[PDB]
């Protein structure tokens, strides 16, 4: 990836390590710490800091939210790769590595999601006026994007993808749900915490939606290549359009993320 994005990503990693310190009970915090970083990095998170900067604010205003987004995603990744006895989830080729047993992964997943809201409720600075109304709004975006009508519908419908007999349209929908909504949430939260106006939030939201969707297709391309650049050009186009109206030292970086 590009220097700017990798640098933003590294600040989230630093912020996460400084926030999750292994302590007793280690049997609890070791898995919590390991599993947070074992989940893949997600742009819905760096996008939150980036969106913030673009509209005004300073990246520190969106850190807590960016960490929360990563954590909600981290929890979902852990659960979707969970060893399930009954063959309920189409035994996915993935076969990722597992340092801990199913029970500890299940539970750690369950402890990571609340940690996200904790940092958010506790990132409330006495010296910030509109702090609580925006944090609150962001908690709502996050819990919705990680809920039953968001990322969860995406994971659920993804179990119905039969390798090379499922259409591109369906796959794009699963990526929209599974990655698009979280990205849309990240750019919007950043936009919110930065201080933009409704019109910009929706623009950045719409941008996140398309970009996360395109990103999911990329990670799905390595799977079954039917992916024409017709699908990708489509989403790339849809993304940049939403960005029309932002110009400057980042509003070309935000553009680079898709270009």
């Amino acid at each position: 990836m590009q220097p700017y994005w990798a640098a933003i990503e590294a600040d989230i990693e630093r912020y996460l390590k400084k926030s999750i310190t292994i302590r007793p009970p280690e049997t609890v915090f070791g898995p919590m710490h390991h599993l947070t970083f074992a989940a893949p990095a997600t742009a819905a998170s760096t996008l939150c800091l980036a969106a913030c900067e673009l509209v005004g604010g300073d990246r520190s205003q969106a850190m807590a939210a960016a960490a929360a987004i990563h954590l909600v995603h981290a929890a979902a990744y852990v659960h979707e790769h969970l060893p399930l006895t009954d063959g309920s989830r189409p035994v996915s080729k993935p076969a990722i590595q597992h340092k801990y047993g199913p029970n500890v992964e299940l539970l750690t997943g369950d402890g990571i999601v609340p940690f996200g809201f904790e940092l958010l409720a506790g990132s409330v600075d006495p010296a910030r006026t509109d702090d609580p109304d925006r944090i609150l709004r962001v908690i709502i975006e996050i819990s919705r994007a990680g809920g039953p009508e968001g990322m969860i519908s995406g994971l659920h419908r993804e179990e119905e993808i039969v390798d090379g007999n499922t259409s591109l349209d369906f796959i794009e929908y699963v990526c929209k749900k599974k990655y698009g909504e979280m990205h849309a949430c990240g750019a919007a939260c950043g936009a919110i915490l930065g201080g933009a106006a409704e019109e910009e939030i929706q623009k950045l939201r719409n941008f996140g939606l398309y970009q996360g969707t395109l990103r999911g297709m990329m990670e799905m391309k390595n799977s079954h290549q039917l992916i024409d650049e017709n699908i990708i050009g489509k989403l790339k186009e849809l993304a940049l359009e939403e960005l029309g109206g932002f110009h400057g030292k980042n509003a070309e970086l935000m553009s680079s993320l898709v270009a």
Partner: protein
């Protein structure tokens, strides 16, 4: 004169009616069917009542507490759904019906559990009316701390990871019960106390009270696990028997266990003296019920 059976019957009807409205069937259908199947199957609603009674106690009303009350019950529910899974306690009966995974598959049970967890935060955050924004945020943080790696989840993980522990110190058995069970009840009493406008001292007193009944609740759970049948409880009873699990009926036997619950109740009710006895009657009642319930 306090009619507890009457008070709870209506509080629970009121809580059940709001749980059904907050989680409706909608696409994706199976995920939602799975959320309602376990959430509206039929718990006693101790946590949501505790939340509502603490809010009313410090001056507020049920309507301001109802969403958080529902939220603590959402998180309570998913925690049982995940506890029942084959990789966990692997049970087949919960609230009198087949466990969620047995009826929808393990995949949906995990996902719907996760759905309930996230949605409890969405719901408290978006639906609470009658509370300043900083107050809601604050309550969301209390909720988060009480169900995470310093609360519910920490208790639960030390639980499965200490199931071989035969050298189980009481300090270890208290860590488990305080966390896997008392942490969620405290949060329930705290969300209500804060949402009702309670002053820090009242919050602190109810937190202490809540820690008491919270521990009492698990001691009592362990004694029913051992003196009642699965039909009775509504869930698979007696596995804690076999395993090397750290229940109280282990380290002191049902008897020295009962006396203990007795001291806890008293101790909790002693914290209620901070409040006018007429106003505390409901929480006093919820406390004896926690001690005396049959299931």
């Amino acid at each position: 004169m306090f009619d507890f059976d009457g008070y709870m019957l209506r509080k629970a009807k009121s809580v059940n009616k709001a749980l059904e409205a907050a989680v409706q069937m909608k696409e994706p259908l199976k995920i939602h069917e799975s959320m309602r199947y376990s959430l509206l199957a039929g718990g006693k609603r101790v946590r949501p009542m505790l939340c509502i009674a603490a809010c009313e106690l410090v001056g507020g009303d049920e309507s301001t507490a109802m969403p958080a009350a529902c939220a603590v019950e959402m998180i309570h529910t998913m925690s049982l759904m995940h506890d029942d899974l084959p990789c966990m306690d692997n049970d087949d009966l919960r609230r009198g019906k087949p466990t969620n995974h047995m009826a929808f598959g393990e995949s949906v049970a995990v996902l719907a559990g996760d759905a309930l967890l996230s949605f409890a935060f969405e719901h408290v955050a978006a639906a609470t009316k009658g509370a300043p924004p900083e107050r809601i945020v604050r309550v969301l943080g209390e909720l988060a701390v009480s169900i995470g790696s310093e609360g519910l989840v920490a208790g639960q993980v030390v639980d499965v990871c200490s199931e071989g522990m035969a050298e189980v110190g009481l300090d270890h058995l208290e860590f488990i019960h305080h966390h896997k069970t008392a942490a969620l009840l405290q949060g329930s009493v705290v969300l209500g106390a804060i949402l009702g406008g309670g002053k820090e001292e009242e919050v602190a007193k109810l937190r202490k009270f809540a820690n008491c009944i919270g521990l009492l609740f698990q001691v009592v759970d362990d004694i029913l696990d051992v003196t009642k049948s699965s039909k009775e409880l509504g869930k698979t009873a007696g596995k804690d028997l076999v395993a090397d699990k750290t229940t109280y009926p282990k380290l002191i036997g049902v008897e020295k266990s009962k006396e203990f619950a007795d001291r806890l109740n008293r101790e909790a009710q002693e914290q209620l003296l901070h409040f006018h006895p007429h106003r505390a009657a409901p929480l006093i009642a919820l406390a004896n019920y926690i001690a005396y319930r049959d299931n």
